[PDB]
Design a binder for this molecule. Structure first.
Ligand SMILES: Cc1cccnc1NC(P(=O)(O)O)P(=O)(O)O
Ligand SMILES: Cc1cccnc1NC(P(=O)(O)O)P(=O)(O)O
Ligand SMILES: [Mg+2]
Ligand SMILES: [Mg+2]
Ligand SMILES: [Mg+2]
Ligand SMILES: [Mg+2]
Ligand SMILES: [Mg+2]
Ligand SMILES: [Mg+2]
Lengths: 359, 358
């Protein structure tokens, strides 16, 4: 039922967008066709956890009529959800190019589609981000919360890009970070710290994936200040670290057929939670071997790293992390429940879609 | 001296942005230092035609204390930097997309020795995000904020649509199908003046010409005072002409006054020369062109160039420039009538544009 409406508003947004191109940007049928397929492939097919969370938070918070408010709040909530989903899609397009990924949810990455050029794809991602602004101005022009909704959505958008910078520079010794001088992979790996990993992940995932759907849902239902923000943020940061940690773990141990891609972070020499947790507990013998084998397509060198990760019980460390998170999450949600029982419950519902996710 | 304050506010903008990163986004001196270089390299060293035009429009309009002047002109330099940062964002992405080698005589951002393409794509995105950040900082209490950012974004969006037109313009559009490959078009039935006009209008004209005038107007609190249909006609014609000039220079300006060796031939770009050549050419000429366009072999590239040379494209260009100058003159008068002050600032903008050497 949340799914049924979400999906109608998708059609609504697409129609306004594609038509506005036809009417005011002199676009031809062919490019409109190009763009409708780009939009569908890039924005549809996922679980819509971010987008659906807005609707769910908005519904929860209604309690504070023909049902005319209800109809308007829930429709705004779907628009907002699509804003966050189109933001994800923009990033996905750019991130797959940047991470030189091959597939995503069983389909070739967008820039790997037979008829999509690498150059057109960069600009396709840019289109996605702009559509967020376009749809928002179309639906919300006469909303009092406009300026505040967009101010936060743009801060979150920026935080995610800062996060991407962290991620994409966490393999070179930062003291040697310099545009005007060539530089290779950190052969010492001394920056692969839990501390630095938590920073990468807070900024690249947690803000847009966990804080923004909560905050947007609150805004459209006009309940932003009914909620302890500090505790809400603690939650989002914590749920968002765990999610990313899950992404990292699944990237190594989850079979392609369930992951939607032949996972590569090892290959990519990525600063993952597995890398860093391994490096901190690991012996000198283990560490040298790992250094000898991380960041290489060779099937046996990446399977060495996998044996090492197993040897060192990273799977059990994960069970231990997940358990700490769950209790930290339980305690925070109850502090929320005191004054925000409707909201705590929608966060619960978000935690449910996250904790031990199959994805 | 408009340049002097323009650079002062750049520092202010910079200082707020980098300090917000260390204070609120847990950044370290190394990445901050990387981001200061990136911001400098990509945002400075140009002519600042877009940015300075905002200031000039706002100066031309503060008659219709003597310290509202101070505030309106400070607003106007922020706006100018929003538009230059917007440019810079697109140059970062465009040079990767267009696979270019230098810009203004340095290696393009993504060719810098220790910048990856991977990181440069995201650098581009940082640029765009900064336009929003700087604006919320200086303008949050300013009542024109919603209108300013609304149009700014519309122009951003039009620039990106134009880039789509540019980048899909060497393939037959009937066959645009994400799921099937298709090589460069062998018939160029769509290198037309028509299609050229559309690329250029959206990708250049709006952010380069309209947006600087529009933002100057908004911080002057004088937008409804001008004939927008006319202002728009002007920006579109002025913008088309500029890009025509960009295309011609790409082929005929010697790398060193240009600041790069040109890419439009080898990319098989729908340039103004390509479409103006194709429209007047014999069939022999068309076949020779067809055997040589979208190629890096340097004597095919000087064949193509000699085809253009020997089809008199400079007389065609001189006649276009004259017909553009003439229509510019007319439109500036229709606008001078009710908006005397604004016309002048549009005329100064045209003066920075008409037969530009730099
Ligand atoms: C697409 C994206 C946005 C923000 C954070 N991560 C993202 N991608 C993930 P992917 O979905 O695993 O590519 P990664 O960070 O592992 O490349
Ligand atoms: C960067 C850019 C933005 C808008 C229009 N043109 C741009 N670049 C130009 P360049 O500056 O000539 O690369 P082109 O259109 O020829 O690639
Ligand atoms: Mg990534
Ligand atoms: Mg990726
Ligand atoms: Mg991953
Ligand atoms: Mg280009
Ligand atoms: Mg270029
Ligand atoms: Mg050019």
């Amino acid at each position: 039922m949340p799914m049924q409406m979400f999906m109608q508003v998708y059609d609504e947004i697409q129609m306004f967008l594609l038509e506005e191109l036809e009417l005011k940007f002199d676009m031809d049928p062919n490019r409109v066709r190009y763009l409708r397929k780009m939009m569908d492939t890039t924005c549809l097919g996922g679980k819509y956890n971010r987008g659906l969370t807005v609707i769910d938070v908005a519904e929860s918070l209604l309690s504070l009529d023909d049902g005319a408010r209800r109809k308007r709040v829930l429709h705004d909530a779907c628009v907002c959800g699509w804003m966050i989903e189109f933001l994800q899609a923009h990033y996905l397009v750019e991130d797959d190019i940047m991470d030189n990924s091959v597939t995503r949810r069983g389909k070739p990455c967008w820039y790997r589609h037979p008829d999509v050029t690498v150059q057109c794809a960069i600009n396709d991602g840019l289109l996605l981000k702009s559509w967020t602004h376009m749809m928002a101005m179309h639906f919300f022009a006469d909303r009092p919360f406009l300026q505040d909704l967009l101010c936060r959505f743009n801060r979150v958008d920026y935080t995610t890009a800062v996060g991407q910078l962290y991620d994409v520079t966490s393999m070179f010794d930062s003291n040697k970070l310099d545009p005007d001088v060539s530089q290779p992979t950190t052969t010492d790996f001394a920056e692969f710290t839990l501390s630095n990993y938590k920073r990468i992940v807070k900024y690249k995932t947690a803000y847009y994936t966990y804080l923004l759907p909560l905050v947007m849902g609150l805004i459209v239902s006009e309940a932003l200040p009914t909620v302890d923000m500090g505790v809400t943020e603690e939650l989002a940061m914590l749920m968002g670290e765990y999610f990313q940690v899950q992404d990292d773990v699944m990237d190594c141990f989850t079979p392609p057929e369930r992951l939607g891609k032949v996972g590569t972070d090892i290959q990519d020499a990525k600063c993952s939670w597995l890398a860093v947790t391994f490096l901190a507990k690991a012996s000198s013998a283990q560490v040298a071997e790992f250094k000898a084998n991380y960041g290489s397509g060779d099937s046996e060198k990446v399977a060495t790293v996998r044996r090492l990760y197993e040897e060192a019980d990273l799977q059990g460390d994960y069970v231990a992390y997940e358990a700490a998170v769950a209790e930290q999450v339980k305690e925070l949600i109850e502090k929320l429940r005191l004054c925000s029982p409707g909201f705590a419950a929608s966060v619960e519902t978000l935690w449910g879609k996250t904790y031990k996710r199959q994805k």
